[PDB]
């Protein structure tokens, strides 16, 4: 899982901040 308001960017391999 990622921290809140972060998603798993498979391309990057890291939890990225996302909005939606």
């Amino acid at each position, epitope marked *: *899982a*990622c*921290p809140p308001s972060h998603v*798993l960017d*498979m391309r*990057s*391999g890291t*939890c990225l901040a996302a909005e939606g």
Partner: antibody
Amino acid sequence: EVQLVESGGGLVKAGGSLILSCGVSNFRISAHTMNWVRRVPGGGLEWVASISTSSTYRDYADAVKGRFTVSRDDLEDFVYLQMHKMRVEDTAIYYCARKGSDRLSDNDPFDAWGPGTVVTVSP
Amino acid sequence: VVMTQSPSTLSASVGDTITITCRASQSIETWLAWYQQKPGKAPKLLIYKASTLKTGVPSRFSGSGSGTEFTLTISGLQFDDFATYHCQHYAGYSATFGQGTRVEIKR
């Protein structure tokens, strides 16, 4: 070279508690995400828990979520794993491992593991 | 994300070139490592990012694949190479392993 060493294992009765620590040699933990992994009697490995750098986020496996706690000590280079309300299937060899590699990057594997500490939960 | 390693037991002979496969439930890019573990010891890192051979590790080891399917290849088994091999997916702050493959001398 890069070494880890876990201590704290033993025999625990079911429902009981046990805490593991993990110290290191030849590097600083503050640069890495630290992980707890366990090898069950079946033969396979299971990812247990992790802390991000400076404790920003802690992640747990579903099977241990709510029962285990992972902590880190950047100043004295130690990692902790609190295990509560222990189940029989918690019986395994427990390793601490660091997320890293030869050439550090954004997303790294587990390049260094401690030798492991045995944890057995009595039915 | 679920990992499925195959086979559970691989029976082989010294000198053989053998292959272990690992299939991810969903696309995983190339984020996968392979590990070797001898009974009572720690897992050793062999290959990461699908195909990057860790320094020090013998060149007879090699991995490939991308997306949902990955394969470990050992070209010319040595006695030392009989052990258990694990596939791992690593992303974010978590990870997930395969069941493991045990490699044994065939008779």
